[PDB]
Amino acid sequence: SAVQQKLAALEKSSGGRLGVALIDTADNTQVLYRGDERFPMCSTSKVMAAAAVLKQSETQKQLLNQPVEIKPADLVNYNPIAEKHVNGTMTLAELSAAALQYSDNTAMNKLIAQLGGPGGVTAFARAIGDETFRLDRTASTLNTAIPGDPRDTTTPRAMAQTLRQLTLGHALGETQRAQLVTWLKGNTTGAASIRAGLPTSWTVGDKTGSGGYGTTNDIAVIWPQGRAPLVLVTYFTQPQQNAESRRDVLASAARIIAEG
Numbered sequence: 001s002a003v004q005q006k007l008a009a010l011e012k013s014s015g016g017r018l019g020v021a022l023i024d025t026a027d028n029t030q031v032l033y034r035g036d037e038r039f040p041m042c043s044t045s046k047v048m049a050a051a052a053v054l055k056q057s058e059t060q061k062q063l064l065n066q067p068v069e070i071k072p073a074d075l076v077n078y079n080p081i082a083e084k085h086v087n088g089t090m091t092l093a094e095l096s097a098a099a100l101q102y103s104d105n106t107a108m109n110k111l112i113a114q115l116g117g118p119g120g121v122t123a124f125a126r127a128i129g130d131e132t133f134r135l136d137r138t139a140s141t142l143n144t145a146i147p148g149d150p151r152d153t154t155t156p157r158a159m160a161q162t163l164r165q166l167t168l169g170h171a172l173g174e175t176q177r178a179q180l181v182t183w184l185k186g187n188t189t190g191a192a193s194i195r196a197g198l199p200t201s202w203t204v205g206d207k208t209g210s211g212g213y214g215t216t217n218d219i220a221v222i223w224p225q226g227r228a229p230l231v232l233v234t235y236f237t238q239p240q241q242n243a244e245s246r247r248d249v250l251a252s253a254a255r256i257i258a259e260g
């Protein structure tokens with residue numbers, strides 16, 4: 001299609017490997033570019049972890065208020081919010097917002113621990129019909145995003161369909177899906193990624209990811225005015241282990257998609 005030609009050109013100009021999946025919920029049409037290839041999720045897997053805890057809260061109705069201790073041994077490579085609460089506690093709601101809106105990795109690790117380990121996140125994905133997602137590791141001081149490594153990967157198509165079910169669909173309970181949407185809309189780390197390529201009349205909720213091999217990711221739910229919402233997943237990774245982030249590529253992907 002015309003969109004796939006422009007995305008292929010973007011990828012060629014970029015020196016890396018781009019994966020895109022768009023779902024237009026008006027008519028369930030999809031646009032895919034490398035949609036069935038695996039990409040390291042990096043921090044975009046935090047949406048699944050937060051959603052899995054939200055799912056637990058449909059039974060444990062006050063779970064989001066539960067305090068969690070933050071100890072020095074909990075700190076990993078990047079924990080901008082949790083570091084402010086060492087030797088105190090944060091609620092699971094506060095940890096979820098920190099994980100989602102400030103990409104706090106200690107907060108993500110507490111969500112994973114609440115689910116019983118990364119296999120609890122993967123299980124939630126399977127329970128909502130995502131067979132592709134796999135989360136294998138907690139965050140540590142040394143995380144990886146290695147080409148060909150199947151750990152902590154998904155495909156663009158699978159992530160877009162899951163994000164759709166979690167936000168626009170009813171894979172979560174009513175207050176839970178609204179809470180997830182609020183958190184995603186409040187993300188503070190995405191200004192240079194998908195949001196930068198979209199018309200400013202569109203409301204966006206997104207989660208970014210970044211990692212080794214210059215891996216640069218963003219997954220978004222998009223609400224244009226007077227038009228059915230869109231789900232857009234943009235994954236990007238590069239051949240050099242120490243490659244720089246390329247959030248501009250994600251912005252350009254989104255701009256190509258929005259034009260179409």
Ligand SMILES: *C(=O)[C@@H](NC(=O)/C(=N\OC(C)(C)C(=O)O)c1csc(N)n1)[C@@H]1N=C(C(=O)O)C(=C)CS1
Pocket residue numbers: 040041042043044077078102103104105143144145189207208209210211212
């Ligand atoms: C999610 O993607 C997180 N990324 C990381 O923790 C990784 N690297 O973080 C930096 C700070 C660059 C580091 O080198 O320590 C990483 C490397 S391999 C892998 N799987 N993850 C957080 N999310 C973001 C984000 O884009 O939202 C960041 C800006 C980095 S921390």
